[PDB]
Design a protein around this ligand. Sequence first.
Ligand SMILES: O=[N+]([O-])c1ccc2[nH]nnc2c1
Ligand SMILES: O=[N+]([O-])c1ccc2[nH]nnc2c1
Ligand SMILES: O=[N+]([O-])c1ccc2[nH]nnc2c1
Ligand SMILES: C[As](C)(=O)[O-]
Ligand SMILES: [Zn+2]
Ligand SMILES: [Zn+2]
Ligand SMILES: [Zn+2]
Ligand SMILES: [Zn+2]
Length: 126
Amino acid sequence: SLKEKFAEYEAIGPRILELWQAARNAFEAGDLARVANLLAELKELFKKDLNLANAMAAEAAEAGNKEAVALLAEQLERLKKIQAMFAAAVNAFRAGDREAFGALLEAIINEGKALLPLVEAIKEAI
Ligand SMILES: O=[N+]([O-])c1ccc2[nH]nnc2c1
Ligand SMILES: O=[N+]([O-])c1ccc2[nH]nnc2c1
Ligand SMILES: O=[N+]([O-])c1ccc2[nH]nnc2c1
Ligand SMILES: C[As](C)(=O)[O-]
Ligand SMILES: [Zn+2]
Ligand SMILES: [Zn+2]
Ligand SMILES: [Zn+2]
Ligand SMILES: [Zn+2]
């Protein structure tokens, strides 16, 4: 059910954000092994997050819950942006482009931080 799905979703976002912060700490220290591991952990979690968000959006539409549909639409649009910067960042990390990678990590984290209040609103709205 929707609250069931949201209950699963609620805990994913902060685990993802913790990994991005861990990736930036590792990168700034030169620990390139660990950055790669973290990026690989993030691929699987971020895929789960997006699958769950899309599932919640579809269920909120089925229920005719206008304001959850709108909040989930914002969430999905922001996640799609992070997804593209993530793809860009892995490509930059593999190319050895430190300027591109550091810039994208910073931007990704800034986007992720902004999702926590939106998840809070989604909880109220469902
Ligand atoms: O990718 N992220 O950085 C990130 C941050 C917060 C989130 N909340 N829900 N999913 C999330 C993903
Ligand atoms: O981005 N937000 O954190 C956030 C929170 C509550 C909202 N209500 N409407 N748009 C919203 C966006
Ligand atoms: O309870 N709500 O349905 C609801 C709707 C829009 C919101 N924006 N921020 N928090 C919100 C809660
Ligand atoms: C109805 As609204 C998009 O201000 O939460
Ligand atoms: Zn239907
Ligand atoms: Zn809004
Ligand atoms: Zn609210
Ligand atoms: Zn609102």
